[PDB]
Amino acid sequence: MANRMILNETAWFGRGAVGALTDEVKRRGYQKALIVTDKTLVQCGVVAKVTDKMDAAGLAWAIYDGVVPNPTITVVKEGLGVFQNSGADYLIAIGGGSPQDTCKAIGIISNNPEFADVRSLEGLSPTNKPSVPILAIPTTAGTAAEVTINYVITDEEKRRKFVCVDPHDIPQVAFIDADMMDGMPPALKAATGVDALTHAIEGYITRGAWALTDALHIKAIEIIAGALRGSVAGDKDAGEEMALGQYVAGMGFSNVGLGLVHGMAHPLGAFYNTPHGVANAILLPHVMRYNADFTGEKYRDIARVMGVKVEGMSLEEARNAAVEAVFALNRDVGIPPHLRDVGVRKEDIPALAQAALDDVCTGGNPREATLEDIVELYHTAW
Amino acid sequence: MANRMILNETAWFGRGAVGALTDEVKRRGYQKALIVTDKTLVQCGVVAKVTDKMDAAGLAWAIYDGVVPNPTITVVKEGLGVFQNSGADYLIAIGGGSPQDTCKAIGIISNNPEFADVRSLEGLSPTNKPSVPILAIPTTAGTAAEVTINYVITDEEKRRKFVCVDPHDIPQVAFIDADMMDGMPPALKAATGVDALTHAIEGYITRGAWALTDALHIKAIEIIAGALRGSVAGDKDAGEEMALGQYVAGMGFSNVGLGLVHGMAHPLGAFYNTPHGVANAILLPHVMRYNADFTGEKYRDIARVMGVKVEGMSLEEARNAAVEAVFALNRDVGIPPHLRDVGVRKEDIPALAQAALDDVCTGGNPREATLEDIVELYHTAW
Ligand SMILES: NC(=O)c1ccc[n+]([C@@H]2O[C@H](COP(=O)([O-])OP(=O)(O)OC[C@H]3O[C@@H](n4cnc5c(N)ncnc54)[C@H](O)[C@@H]3O)[C@@H](O)[C@H]2O)c1
Ligand SMILES: NC(=O)c1ccc[n+]([C@@H]2O[C@H](COP(=O)([O-])OP(=O)(O)OC[C@H]3O[C@@H](n4cnc5c(N)ncnc54)[C@H](O)[C@@H]3O)[C@@H](O)[C@H]2O)c1
Ligand SMILES: [Cl-]
Ligand SMILES: [Fe+3]
Ligand SMILES: [Fe+3]
């Protein structure tokens, strides 16, 4: 079959890309905006960075900083609520995947009221109308939610993180600039960073993978690999690189899927509020082994673009170098090696496994996985 | 400053991507389409490939096959005309850069009546409204007009081919499938193909160049370089590869510019009806030389991805390998080596040089060029 690609029809890159917002707004005559964000972000004067420009440019805006890490259906509802009573024309998502994924949720439902519940929006959410125009402004080195046609919400009730995929999510314009992301504490940079790396690697070997997708992913890996460290260390230049690499990774996996690393990470989110960045970080290497054999020459390239001199290695050799380069990075970035460090409980392995087994992302894994295979993984990752 | 990226918000790739058309139209309830095309394409049962699917899907369509190679203002007017009298909800561009560039022209003017002239639309076209939704379906290994924000028109009167640039031009969906391109005779595959390679190389070294754009271009070069030959010799899989590479190149140069090769080729089109592809083809290597020194390590990369073992080479060495790899391909592909072979006159070089000096593309050249410098070029290319 043919492959479909869904990208931002417009996107801005580099320190100060946020400056281009006011004009994008004008250029397309929007009247009022609902800013969807964190309270942490508003307090740290990050949102101000945008509202201030909007103010000077005389642009109307209202805020909703109700989002919390791992956005729940109640948050999404509260937002839709705030949205419906603002004369808001569009929305601006300032923040990581949470406020951004929340924002996409709000945009879709506000036009597909049909799906007010928000369960009914999992998988390929059967929407008939494109979401309210949304401007994405990421503040983290990961998610790439600014380009992906997907959002994940948490159903606290059913302690399970569910993924929603719909080409109707996609922002009209994405503003990617490290200036908005400089605030990230080291731990946060590392976490989001590795999430992006995870995104890149899982998309390079996902099942839908093909020419364009592979090209994008491998490049993203390359970028991420050679900068996450310096960024976590503070090098602002490396931060700008990260900002790009995470975005590139999104251009790919969004249009092609991921794998178990994400499938085995979501349940971990829903179960212990384990930061996605950290979850993937911990699994990734292990899941990579579990996948090694079903990835042809892939890992060779992965190992290469990560500094490993894969020259003269055997495919098996390379496959270990790759998995190892990863382990190496997490350690060098401060991510705990085991799930036991992040409070995962063995008595839950069975539950999680099932949660993962079902999770939408899993299907994209190059190597089918059985409940037991996964159980095995969670353990050997504990 | 920041870099802005403008891509297709939606694109389909692969043999049969045209199949996804009917649905797209539906998933976004349009009503009627004006097919902008050739007669050659019509007679060759190529447009049928689309009209047939639309008919079966019960989609209304009207055709306009008045386009000709290197489309003139009169053609663009005649089209706008036919369009303004059809009940045309949106338009579908089936064909190379001509029917596609014609189509974008028609789409823009039909919403920015302000420029019914078509000179008043050169450079950064000051349009205030986005063009009529246009679905691009390329039939050639080049142009990439389906993703670039620019169309070029011919002012037969003031015989000079002028480039028009405007983010409003951009098609809503692009359908890239080698099935539409299989008809290209070898000389055509060759010509359009090298045009694509030309785009990739020029965009890789154009002044606006940066991270994302460098990545895209270098990948495109890689793809094109490794398939054009096979495609021209008949390999359908090589054809599918080309289809992608040319599109990829578009993703880059559209958003960053080109250089002299295109600036020196346009006047050649306007003057002698020289196929854009063959013109670029002939110049390219020469212009590359004139540029070598102002392209850092760029050529080294170019040479590599073209099969050149740039291993123990000096930057000078590599730079020559690159320019050579090109000469090598043109030959292998059947493109005449001198402008004299394509009827270029030596009495006119001064005219052309001026024409090129004024061409919008030129300014992107990494090395400033003077009228005389260009004259030098046209001569050493004759
Ligand atoms: N389905 C998928 O493929 C996929 C992929 C990636 C992420 N996700 C989802 O994305 C979310 C992860 O988002 P996230 O990692 O950005 O975190 P987040 O936004 O959920 O939380 C980040 C925390 O860091 C703070 N923060 C955010 N940006 C900051 C900045 N620039 N400076 C200082 N502090 C900042 C916030 O205030 C917040 O407390 C999860 O909900 C996850 O499930 C899904
Ligand atoms: N601004 C830019 O960057 C840029 C880049 C490339 C070209 N251009 C312009 O675009 C045009 C280039 O168009 P083009 O060379 O792709 O082709 P075209 O459509 O202009 O003309 C192609 C000719 O080849 C025939 N043809 C096209 N597809 C065919 C197929 N599948 N099978 C058999 N015959 C086929 C057509 O019938 C026509 O006669 C030129 O007018 C050029 O000036 C601009
Ligand atoms: Cl108000
Ligand atoms: Fe993730
Ligand atoms: Fe061209």
Coordinates of C-alpha atoms in Angstrom, one line a residue, chain B residues 6-374:
Chain B
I6 CA 6.5 25.1 4.8
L7 CA 5.5 21.6 3.9
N8 CA 2.5 19.8 2.6
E9 CA 0.2 19.4 5.6
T10 CA -0.7 16.1 3.9
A11 CA 1.1 13.8 1.4
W12 CA 0.8 10.3 0.0
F13 CA 3.7 8.3 -1.3
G14 CA 4.1 5.1 -3.3
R15 CA 2.7 3.2 -6.3
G16 CA -1.0 3.9 -6.3
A17 CA -0.9 7.0 -4.0
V18 CA -3.4 8.4 -6.4
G19 CA -5.9 6.0 -5.0
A20 CA -6.0 7.9 -1.8
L21 CA -7.2 11.0 -3.7
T22 CA -11.0 10.4 -4.0
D23 CA -11.1 9.9 -0.2
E24 CA -9.1 13.0 0.7
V25 CA -11.6 15.0 -1.4
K26 CA -14.4 13.4 0.6
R27 CA -12.8 13.6 4.0
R28 CA -12.9 17.3 3.4
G29 CA -16.1 17.7 1.5
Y30 CA -15.2 19.7 -1.6
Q31 CA -17.6 19.6 -4.5
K32 CA -16.0 20.0 -7.9
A33 CA -12.4 20.0 -9.3
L34 CA -10.7 21.6 -12.2
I35 CA -8.0 19.4 -13.6
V36 CA -5.2 21.6 -14.8
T37 CA -3.0 19.7 -17.4
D38 CA -1.5 18.8 -20.8
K39 CA -3.1 17.2 -23.7
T40 CA -0.1 14.8 -24.0
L41 CA -1.0 13.6 -20.4
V42 CA -4.6 13.4 -21.5
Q43 CA -4.0 11.5 -24.6
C44 CA -1.6 9.1 -22.9
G45 CA -4.4 7.8 -20.6
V46 CA -2.6 9.3 -17.6
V47 CA -5.2 11.8 -16.5
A48 CA -7.7 9.0 -17.0
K49 CA -5.9 7.1 -14.1
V50 CA -7.3 9.8 -11.9
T51 CA -10.6 10.8 -13.5
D52 CA -11.6 7.2 -13.7
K53 CA -11.2 6.8 -9.9
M54 CA -13.0 10.1 -9.3
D55 CA -15.8 9.0 -11.5
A56 CA -16.2 5.7 -9.8
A57 CA -16.1 7.5 -6.5
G58 CA -18.8 9.8 -7.9
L59 CA -16.6 12.9 -7.8
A60 CA -17.3 15.9 -10.1
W61 CA -14.5 17.2 -12.3
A62 CA -13.8 19.5 -15.2
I63 CA -10.6 19.5 -17.2
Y64 CA -8.3 22.2 -18.6
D65 CA -5.5 20.8 -20.7
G66 CA -4.3 24.1 -22.2
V67 CA -1.0 24.1 -20.4
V68 CA 2.2 24.0 -22.4
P69 CA 5.9 23.5 -21.5
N70 CA 7.2 26.7 -19.9
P71 CA 3.7 28.2 -19.3
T72 CA 3.0 31.7 -20.4
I73 CA 0.9 34.4 -18.8
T74 CA -1.7 33.8 -21.5
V75 CA -1.9 30.2 -20.4
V76 CA -2.3 31.1 -16.8
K77 CA -5.0 33.6 -17.8
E78 CA -6.9 31.1 -20.0
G79 CA -6.8 28.7 -17.1
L80 CA -8.0 31.2 -14.4
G81 CA -10.7 31.9 -17.0
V82 CA -11.8 28.3 -17.5
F83 CA -11.7 27.9 -13.7
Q84 CA -13.9 31.0 -13.0
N85 CA -16.6 29.3 -15.1
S86 CA -16.8 25.7 -13.9
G87 CA -18.2 25.4 -10.4
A88 CA -14.8 24.3 -9.4
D89 CA -14.5 23.9 -5.7
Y90 CA -10.8 23.1 -5.8
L91 CA -8.2 22.1 -8.4
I92 CA -6.1 19.0 -9.1
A93 CA -2.8 19.4 -10.8
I94 CA -1.8 16.4 -12.8
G95 CA 1.5 16.8 -14.6
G96 CA 5.0 18.2 -14.3
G97 CA 6.1 21.6 -13.2
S98 CA 4.2 23.3 -16.0
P99 CA 0.6 22.2 -15.3
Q100 CA 1.5 22.4 -11.6
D101 CA 3.0 25.8 -11.7
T102 CA 0.2 26.9 -13.9
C103 CA -2.3 25.5 -11.4
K104 CA -0.7 27.4 -8.4
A105 CA -0.9 30.6 -10.5
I106 CA -4.6 30.0 -11.1
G107 CA -5.2 29.2 -7.5
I108 CA -3.6 32.4 -6.2
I109 CA -5.1 34.9 -8.6
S110 CA -8.6 33.3 -8.1
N111 CA -8.3 34.6 -4.5
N112 CA -6.0 37.5 -5.0
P113 CA -7.7 39.0 -8.1
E114 CA -5.4 41.9 -7.3
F115 CA -2.8 40.2 -9.6
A116 CA -4.7 39.2 -12.7
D117 CA -1.6 40.4 -14.5
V118 CA 1.1 37.7 -13.4
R119 CA 4.2 39.9 -13.2
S120 CA 2.6 41.4 -10.2
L121 CA 3.3 38.0 -8.5
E122 CA 7.0 37.7 -8.9
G123 CA 9.4 37.4 -5.9
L124 CA 7.7 37.3 -2.6
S125 CA 4.1 37.6 -3.9
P126 CA 2.3 40.0 -1.5
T127 CA -0.9 37.9 -1.5
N128 CA -3.3 38.4 1.3
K129 CA -5.4 35.2 0.8
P130 CA -4.4 31.5 0.6
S131 CA -4.8 30.0 -2.9
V132 CA -7.7 27.8 -3.8
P133 CA -7.1 24.3 -2.3
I134 CA -5.0 22.4 -4.8
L135 CA -4.2 18.7 -4.9
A136 CA -0.8 18.1 -6.6
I137 CA -0.1 14.9 -8.6
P138 CA 3.3 15.0 -10.2
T139 CA 4.1 13.0 -13.4
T140 CA 7.8 13.6 -13.4
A141 CA 11.2 13.0 -11.7
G142 CA 11.9 16.6 -10.9
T143 CA 10.1 19.9 -10.3
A144 CA 8.6 19.0 -6.9
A145 CA 6.2 21.8 -7.5
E146 CA 3.8 19.7 -5.4
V147 CA 5.6 20.8 -2.2
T148 CA 7.5 24.0 -3.0
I149 CA 6.0 27.3 -2.3
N150 CA 7.0 28.6 -5.7
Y151 CA 5.8 28.6 -9.4
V152 CA 7.6 30.1 -12.4
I153 CA 5.8 31.7 -15.3
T154 CA 7.0 32.9 -18.7
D155 CA 6.3 36.5 -19.8
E156 CA 6.4 35.8 -23.5
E157 CA 6.1 39.6 -24.0
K158 CA 9.2 40.5 -21.9
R159 CA 10.7 37.1 -22.7
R160 CA 12.2 36.2 -19.3
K161 CA 11.1 33.3 -17.1
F162 CA 10.1 34.8 -13.7
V163 CA 9.9 33.1 -10.3
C164 CA 6.9 33.7 -8.0
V165 CA 7.2 32.7 -4.3
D166 CA 4.4 32.6 -1.8
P167 CA 3.5 30.3 1.2
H168 CA -0.1 30.6 0.0
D169 CA 0.6 28.5 -3.1
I170 CA 1.3 25.3 -1.2
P171 CA -1.0 22.4 -2.2
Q172 CA -3.3 21.0 0.6
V173 CA -2.3 17.4 -0.3
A174 CA 0.4 16.0 -2.6
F175 CA 0.1 12.5 -4.2
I176 CA 3.5 11.1 -5.2
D177 CA 3.3 7.8 -7.1
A178 CA 5.7 6.6 -9.8
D179 CA 2.7 5.1 -11.5
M180 CA 1.9 8.5 -12.9
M181 CA 5.6 8.9 -13.9
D182 CA 6.2 5.6 -15.6
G183 CA 5.2 7.2 -18.9
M184 CA 8.2 9.5 -19.0
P185 CA 10.4 8.7 -22.0
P186 CA 14.1 8.1 -21.0
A187 CA 15.2 11.6 -22.1
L188 CA 12.4 13.1 -19.9
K189 CA 13.2 11.0 -16.9
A190 CA 16.8 12.0 -17.4
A191 CA 16.1 15.7 -17.7
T192 CA 13.6 16.1 -14.9
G193 CA 15.8 13.8 -12.8
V194 CA 18.9 16.0 -13.1
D195 CA 16.7 19.0 -12.4
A196 CA 15.9 17.3 -9.1
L197 CA 19.6 16.6 -8.4
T198 CA 20.2 20.2 -9.3
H199 CA 17.7 21.3 -6.7
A200 CA 19.2 19.1 -4.1
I201 CA 22.8 20.4 -4.7
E202 CA 21.8 24.0 -5.0
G203 CA 19.6 23.9 -1.9
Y204 CA 22.4 22.1 0.0
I205 CA 24.8 25.0 -0.6
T206 CA 22.3 27.9 -0.9
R207 CA 22.8 30.7 1.5
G208 CA 19.7 30.1 3.7
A209 CA 21.0 26.5 4.3
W210 CA 20.8 25.1 7.8
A211 CA 20.5 21.9 9.8
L212 CA 17.1 20.5 8.8
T213 CA 17.5 21.7 5.2
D214 CA 21.0 20.3 4.8
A215 CA 19.8 16.9 6.1
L216 CA 16.9 16.8 3.6
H217 CA 19.0 17.8 0.6
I218 CA 21.9 15.5 1.3
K219 CA 19.5 12.6 1.6
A220 CA 17.7 13.6 -1.7
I221 CA 21.1 13.8 -3.5
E222 CA 21.9 10.3 -2.1
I223 CA 18.6 8.9 -3.4
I224 CA 18.6 10.6 -6.8
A225 CA 22.3 9.8 -7.4
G226 CA 21.6 6.2 -6.7
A227 CA 18.5 5.8 -9.0
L228 CA 18.3 8.3 -11.8
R229 CA 20.4 5.9 -13.9
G230 CA 18.3 2.9 -13.3
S231 CA 15.1 4.9 -13.7
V232 CA 16.3 6.1 -17.1
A233 CA 17.3 2.6 -18.1
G234 CA 13.9 1.4 -17.1
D235 CA 13.9 0.1 -13.6
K236 CA 10.4 0.7 -12.2
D237 CA 11.7 0.4 -8.6
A238 CA 14.4 3.0 -9.5
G239 CA 11.5 5.1 -10.7
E240 CA 9.7 4.8 -7.3
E241 CA 12.9 5.8 -5.6
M242 CA 13.3 8.9 -7.9
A243 CA 9.7 9.9 -7.2
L244 CA 10.7 10.2 -3.6
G245 CA 14.1 11.9 -3.9
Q246 CA 12.7 14.7 -6.1
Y247 CA 10.0 15.4 -3.6
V248 CA 12.5 15.3 -0.7
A249 CA 14.7 17.9 -2.5
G250 CA 11.6 20.0 -2.7
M251 CA 11.1 19.9 1.1
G252 CA 14.4 21.6 1.3
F253 CA 15.1 24.2 -1.4
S254 CA 11.5 25.5 -1.4
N255 CA 12.3 26.6 2.1
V256 CA 15.8 28.0 1.6
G257 CA 16.6 28.9 -2.0
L258 CA 18.8 27.8 -4.8
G259 CA 21.5 29.5 -6.8
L260 CA 23.1 30.4 -10.2
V261 CA 22.4 27.1 -11.9
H262 CA 18.7 27.9 -11.8
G263 CA 19.3 31.6 -12.4
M264 CA 21.3 30.8 -15.5
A265 CA 18.9 28.2 -16.7
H266 CA 15.7 30.2 -16.6
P267 CA 16.9 32.8 -19.1
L268 CA 17.9 29.8 -21.3
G269 CA 14.4 28.6 -21.1
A270 CA 12.8 31.9 -22.0
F271 CA 15.3 32.4 -24.9
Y272 CA 15.6 29.0 -26.6
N273 CA 12.8 26.8 -25.0
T274 CA 15.6 24.7 -23.5
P275 CA 14.1 22.1 -21.2
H276 CA 14.6 23.3 -17.6
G277 CA 16.1 19.9 -16.8
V278 CA 18.7 19.9 -19.6
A279 CA 19.6 23.5 -19.0
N280 CA 20.4 22.9 -15.3
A281 CA 22.1 19.7 -16.2
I282 CA 24.5 21.4 -18.6
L283 CA 25.3 24.3 -16.3
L284 CA 25.4 22.6 -12.9
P285 CA 28.9 21.2 -13.0
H286 CA 30.4 24.4 -14.2
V287 CA 28.5 26.5 -11.7
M288 CA 29.6 24.0 -9.1
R289 CA 33.2 24.8 -9.9
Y290 CA 32.6 28.5 -9.8
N291 CA 31.2 27.8 -6.4
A292 CA 33.4 25.0 -5.0
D293 CA 35.5 27.2 -2.7
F294 CA 32.5 28.7 -0.9
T295 CA 30.9 25.5 0.2
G296 CA 33.0 24.3 3.2
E297 CA 32.9 20.5 3.5
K298 CA 29.7 20.3 1.5
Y299 CA 31.1 18.8 -1.7
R300 CA 32.9 16.2 0.3
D301 CA 29.5 14.9 1.3
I302 CA 28.1 15.4 -2.1
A303 CA 30.9 13.3 -3.7
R304 CA 30.5 10.5 -1.1
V305 CA 26.7 9.9 -1.5
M306 CA 27.4 9.8 -5.2
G307 CA 29.6 6.8 -4.9
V308 CA 32.9 8.7 -4.8
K309 CA 35.3 7.2 -2.2
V310 CA 36.3 10.5 -0.8
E311 CA 38.4 8.6 1.7
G312 CA 42.0 9.9 1.4
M313 CA 40.9 13.0 -0.4
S314 CA 41.8 16.6 0.3
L315 CA 38.9 19.1 0.4
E316 CA 40.2 20.3 -3.0
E317 CA 40.3 16.7 -4.2
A318 CA 36.8 15.9 -3.0
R319 CA 35.4 19.1 -4.4
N320 CA 36.6 18.0 -7.8
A321 CA 35.3 14.5 -7.3
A322 CA 31.9 16.0 -6.7
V323 CA 31.8 18.2 -9.8
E324 CA 33.1 15.2 -11.7
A325 CA 30.5 12.8 -10.4
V326 CA 28.0 15.2 -11.9
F327 CA 29.6 15.4 -15.4
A328 CA 29.7 11.6 -15.2
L329 CA 26.0 11.3 -14.6
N330 CA 24.8 13.7 -17.3
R331 CA 26.8 11.6 -19.7
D332 CA 25.5 8.3 -18.4
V333 CA 22.0 9.8 -18.6
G334 CA 22.2 11.2 -22.1
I335 CA 22.3 14.9 -21.6
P336 CA 24.3 16.9 -24.1
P337 CA 27.5 18.4 -22.6
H338 CA 27.5 21.9 -24.2
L339 CA 24.9 24.7 -24.5
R340 CA 26.0 24.9 -28.1
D341 CA 24.4 21.5 -28.6
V342 CA 21.1 22.9 -27.4
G343 CA 21.2 25.9 -29.7
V344 CA 22.5 28.5 -27.3
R345 CA 24.0 31.4 -29.2
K346 CA 27.1 33.4 -28.3
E347 CA 25.7 36.7 -29.4
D348 CA 23.1 36.4 -26.7
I349 CA 25.3 35.4 -23.8
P350 CA 25.4 39.1 -22.6
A351 CA 21.6 39.2 -22.6
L352 CA 21.3 35.9 -20.8
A353 CA 24.0 36.9 -18.2
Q354 CA 21.9 39.9 -17.4
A355 CA 18.7 37.8 -17.3
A356 CA 20.5 35.4 -14.9
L357 CA 21.9 38.3 -12.8
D358 CA 18.3 39.4 -12.2
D359 CA 16.7 36.0 -11.6
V360 CA 15.5 35.6 -8.0
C361 CA 17.1 32.2 -7.6
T362 CA 20.6 33.7 -8.2
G363 CA 20.8 35.6 -5.0
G364 CA 21.0 32.4 -3.1
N365 CA 24.2 31.4 -4.7
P366 CA 27.0 30.9 -2.0
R367 CA 29.3 33.0 -4.1
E368 CA 28.2 36.4 -5.3
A369 CA 28.3 36.6 -9.1
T370 CA 28.8 39.5 -11.4
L371 CA 27.3 39.9 -14.8
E372 CA 30.8 39.3 -16.3
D373 CA 31.3 36.3 -14.0
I374 CA 28.1 34.8 -15.4

